[PDB]
């Protein structure tokens, strides 16, 4: 029936077009969403693995480092004991480091003292000179004591000289 | 100078030999420790999961359309 | 068409329309001479839009999407564990940090020794200080002696001044030597 | 002469007294005399420095110097009628 036939014909066209439009929408707004849906999951898989490893690394790293501490402390509590012990049953001297840092030999120690005495002798004569200028002592006194310290000096220099003469 | 030199030319010693304490221990410096962040990434997953879930629902809705039509198509042109 | 070019031109710079298989119909052959087909088309275009989905099934696609989902699920579970593990490490690290504070304590007391007393630089400093105190202690006694009328006092003065000086120079020369070394057989 | 190994510390191992029988009675007599002449030389340098510093007057000056100048003359003889040079020799 051309009538009933043409209507059915119209139905086909509306239906085919309605179908095209359906496919079009799905392919543009839905089927696209999976494009990089795998890459996403992939990226995440990559991340956990990394975190996982990092976690194991630090895990071990911290454990070993802890044993180093509980060990580095025993060799510390010990040495600190031996050091704080040396300061008891061993007179660590009056703060004068002089007693600690000494000459390599008794001979040398002697030399240091003679040298010191030599200078110290001048200083003393120098000072008494000043004392005379200030008027603290008369010329009479300065000469006597002066000649004495100057004399004791000649000896000290000869002494130093006789210990070092044999050295040519 | 002669004696002066000789004296200084020879090194001084520490009254106590090996009895004098020394720093035989070095400072053990602790290494740097960093634990990775997880919460941010954890949150970034929700939306990705949710996207999939909604697409799913969209497909069900879409795919369930033919049946809804048949039910209607029946009452309309049938018993 | 022109209406499609508009929908196209707007949204986000589209793509021109893409330039004929037939789709199975329901059972239209039984519908009224036309009054029903006509009514179905003219009044129920919406229904047809539903019907037509049958031929563009998303069953396969949804399956793939559903798999991707499960993985995200799992991925969320992996972090659920990676979190709990990282939780203990956040505590085991809480200990390696406190024990480290306990270490530095001991160490800072071991070092204290060799920096305030037994230390080479310390000793020297300690000595150099004592030396200065002597040079002045000498000068102090100098001025703190305006007059000496007592003959005996003189000798006492000279002996004391002479001694301080020797103690000074002795140490001064000691330092001179020290300034060319660390201190043998430490 | 000298010998190697920087252990020159050995050459000065023990203390050394001032005198040690190596020095004769006469040897000392010279040493003393020289020690006195040296003390008079130092003293005269300070006395002259005091005068030129107006710390003492012509009186004190002339007296003190004249005296020392005389004591020195005696000691200058206790070197002639008693004996390189002496010191450098006695020090070996």
From Swiss-Prot, chain A:
Q: Tell me the outcome of changing residue 69 to D.
A: Defective in ESCRT-I cargo sorting
Q: Where is the SB domain?
A: 105-168
* Effect caused by changing residue 128 to D: Abolishes ESCRT-I complex assembly; class E phenotype (malformed late MVBs)
The listed locations are: Cytoplasm; Endosome; Late endosome membrane
| Impact noted for substituting residue 37 to D | Defective in ESCRT-I cargo sorting; reduces MVB12 localization to MVBs; abolishes interaction with MVB12; reduces interaction with SRN2
Q: Which residues form a coiled coil?
A: 55-83
What family name appears in the similarity comment? Belongs to the ubiquitin-conjugating enzyme family. UEV subfamily.
Task of the protein:
Component of the ESCRT-I complex, a regulator of vesicular trafficking process. Binds to ubiquitinated cargo proteins and is required for the sorting of endocytic ubiquitinated cargos into multivesicular bodies (MVBs). Mediates the association to the ESCRT-0 complex. Required for vacuolar targeting of temperature-sensitive plasma membrane proteins STE2 and CAN1.
Other noteworthy facts: Present with 1360 molecules/cell in log phase SD medium.
Quaternary structure?
Component of the ESCRT-I complex (endosomal sorting complex required for transport I) which consists of STP22, VPS28, SRN2 and MVB12 in a 1:1:1:1 stoichiometry. Interacts with HSE1 and VPS27. Interacts with MVB12 and SRN2.
Q: Domain comment?
A: The UEV domain is required for the interaction of the complex with ubiquitin.
What protein name does the entry list? Suppressor protein STP22 of temperature-sensitive alpha-factor receptor and arginine permease
- Which residues of the whole protein does the chain here span? 218 to 385 of 385
UniProtKB/Swiss-Prot annotation, chain B:
Molecular function via GO: ubiquitin binding
**Keywords attached to this entry:** Acetylation, Cytoplasm, Endosome, Membrane, Phosphoprotein, Protein transport, Transport
Q: What is its main location?
A: cytoplasm
The entry's protein name is Multivesicular body sorting factor 12
Please give the biological process terms from Gene Ontology that the record holds: ATP export; endosome transport via multivesicular body sorting pathway; negative regulation of protein-containing complex assembly; protein targeting to vacuole; ubiquitin-dependent protein catabolic process via the multivesicular body sorting pathway
Quick one: effect of changing residue 45 to D?
A: Defective in MVB12 incorporation in ESCRT-I complex; reduces localization to MVBs; abolishes interaction with STP22 and SRN2
Fill in the misc note. Answer: Present with 752 molecules/cell in log phase SD medium.
Subcellular location(s) per record: Cytoplasm; Endosome; Late endosome membrane
- Write down the membrane topology: Peripheral membrane protein
Origin species:
Saccharomyces cerevisiae (strain ATCC 204508 / S288c) (Baker's yeast)
Within the intact protein, the region shown is 4 to 81 of 101
Q: Please explain the role this protein plays, according to its UniProt record.
A: Component of the ESCRT-I complex, a regulator of vesicular trafficking process. Binds to ubiquitinated cargo proteins and is required for the sorting of endocytic ubiquitinated cargos into multivesicular bodies (MVBs). Appears to be involved in cargo sorting and release of the ESCRT-I complex from the MVBs.
Cite a GO CC annotation.
Answer: cytosol
Gene that produces this protein: MVB12
From Swiss-Prot, chain C:
| Any GO CC annotation of this UniProt entry | endosome
Subcellular compartments: Cytoplasm; Endosome; Late endosome membrane
Q: Name one GO biological process term.
A: protein targeting to membrane
Which consequence is recorded for altering residue 52 to D? Defective in ESCRT-I cargo sorting
Q: Which PROSITE patterns match?
A: VPS37_C (PS51314)
For membrane topology, the record states:
Peripheral membrane protein
The reported effect of residue 72 to D is: Defective in ESCRT-I cargo sorting
Pfam annotation, one family: Mod_r
Q: Cite the entry's keywords alphabetically.
A: Cytoplasm, Endosome, Membrane, Protein transport, Transport
Say yes or no: keyword Membrane present.
yes
Domain named VPS37 C-terminal is located at: 101-186
In its keyword annotation, does this UniProt entry include Methyltransferase?
no
Q: Which family does it belong to?
A: Belongs to the VPS37 family.
Subunit info here reads:
Component of the ESCRT-I complex (endosomal sorting complex required for transport I) which consists of STP22, VPS28, SRN2 and MVB12 in a 1:1:1:1 stoichiometry. Interacts with STP22 and MVB12.
Known function: Component of the ESCRT-I complex, a regulator of vesicular trafficking process. Required for normal endocytic and biosynthetic traffic to the yeast vacuole.
Q: What is this protein called?
A: Protein SRN2
Originating organism: Saccharomyces cerevisiae (strain ATCC 204508 / S288c) (Baker's yeast)
Curated annotation (Swiss-Prot), chain D:
Q: What is the effect of changing residue 34 to D?
A: Abolishes ESCRT-I complex assembly; class E phenotype (malformed late MVB)
- Consequence of substituting residue 38 to D: Abolishes ESCRT-I complex assembly; class E phenotype (malformed late MVB)
The record's subcellular locations are: Cytoplasm; Endosome; Late endosome membrane
Q: Which residues form the VPS28 N-terminal domain?
A: 5-92
Q: Which domain of life is it from?
A: Eukaryota
What additional remark is attached to this entry?
Present with 1420 molecules/cell in log phase SD medium.
- Which family does the record claim for this protein? Belongs to the VPS28 family.
Summary of the function given for this chain in its UniProt record? Component of the ESCRT-I complex, a regulator of vesicular trafficking process. Required for normal endocytic and biosynthetic traffic to the yeast vacuole.
Query: What is the protein's quaternary organization?
Result: Component of the ESCRT-I complex (endosomal sorting complex required for transport I) which consists of STP22, VPS28, SRN2 and MVB12 in a 1:1:1:1 stoichiometry. Self-associates. Interacts with VPS27; the interaction mediates the association with the ESCRT-0 complex. Interacts with VPS20; the interaction mediates the association with the ESCRT-III complex.
What is this protein's record name?
Answer: Vacuolar protein sorting-associated protein 28
Biological source species: Saccharomyces cerevisiae (strain ATCC 204508 / S288c)
Measured against the full-length protein, the chain present covers 7 to 117 of 242
């Amino acid at each position: 029936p051309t009538n009933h036939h043409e209507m059915l014909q119209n139905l086909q066209t509306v239906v085919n077009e309605l179908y095209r439009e359906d496919v079009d929408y799905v392919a543009d707004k839905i089927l696209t969403r999976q494009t990089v849906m795998q890459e996403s999951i992939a990226r995440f898989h990559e991340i956990i693995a990394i975190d996982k490893n990092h976690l194991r690394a630090v895990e071990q790293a911290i454990e070993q480092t802890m044993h180093s501490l509980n060990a580095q402390i025993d060799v510390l509590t010990a040495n600190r004991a031996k050091v704080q012990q040396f300061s008891s049953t061993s007179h660590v001297d009056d703060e004068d480091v002089n007693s600690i840092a000494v000459a390599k030999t008794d001979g040398l120690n002697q030399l240091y003292n003679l040298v010191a005495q030599d200078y110290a002798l001048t200083d003393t004569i120098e000072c008494l000179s000043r004392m005379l200028h200030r008027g603290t002592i008369p010329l009479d006194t300065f000469v006597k004591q002066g000649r004495e310290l100057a004399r004791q000096q000649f000896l000290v220099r000869w002494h130093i000289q006789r210990i070092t003469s044999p050295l040519s | 100078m002669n004696v002066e030199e000789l004296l200084r030319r020879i090194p001084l010693y520490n009254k106590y030999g090996k009895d004098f304490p020394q720093e035989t221990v070095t400072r053990f410096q602790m290494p740097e420790f960093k634990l990775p962040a997880l919460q941010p990434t954890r949150d970034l997953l929700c939306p990705w999961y949710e996207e999939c879930d909604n697409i799913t629902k969209v497909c069900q809705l879409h795919d369930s359309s033919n049946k809804k039509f048949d039910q209607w198509y029946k009452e309309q042109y049938l018993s | 068409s022109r209406l499609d070019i508009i929908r196209a031109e707007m949204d986000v710079v589209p793509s021109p329309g893409l330039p004929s298989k037939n789709i199975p119909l329901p059972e239209g052959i039984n519908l009224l001479s036309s009054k029903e087909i006509i009514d179905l088309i003219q009044t129920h275009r919406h229904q047809l839009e539903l019907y037509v989905t049958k031929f563009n099934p998303l069953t396969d696609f949804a399956g793939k999407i559903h798999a991707f989902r499960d993985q995200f699920k799992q991925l969320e579970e992996n972090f659920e564990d990676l979190h709990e593990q990282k939780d203990k490490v956040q505590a085991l690290l809480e200990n390696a940090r406190i024990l480290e504070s306990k270490y530095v304590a001991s160490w800072q007391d071991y070092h204290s020794e060799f920096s305030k007393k037994y230390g080479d630089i310390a000793l020297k400093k300690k000595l150099e200080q004592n030396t200065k105190k002597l040079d002045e202690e000498s000068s102090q006694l100098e001025t703190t002696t305006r007059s000496i009328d007592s003959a005996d006092d003189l000798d006492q003065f000279i002996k004391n001044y002479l001694d301080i000086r020797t103690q000074y120079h002795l140490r001064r020369e000691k330092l001179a030597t020290w300034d060319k070394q660390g201190n043998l057989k430490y | 002469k000298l010998n190697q190994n920087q252990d020159i510390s050995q050459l000065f191992h023990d203390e050394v007294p001032l005198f040690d029988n190596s020095i004769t009675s006469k040897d000392k007599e010279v040493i003393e005399t020289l020690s006195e002449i040296y003390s008079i030389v130092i003293t005269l340098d300070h006395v002259e420095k005091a005068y030129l510093k107006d710390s003492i007057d012509d009186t004190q000056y002339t007296n003190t110097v004249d005296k020392l100048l005389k004591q020195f003359k005696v000691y200058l003889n206790s070197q002639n009628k008693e004996e390189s040079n002496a010191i450098t020799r006695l020090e070996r």
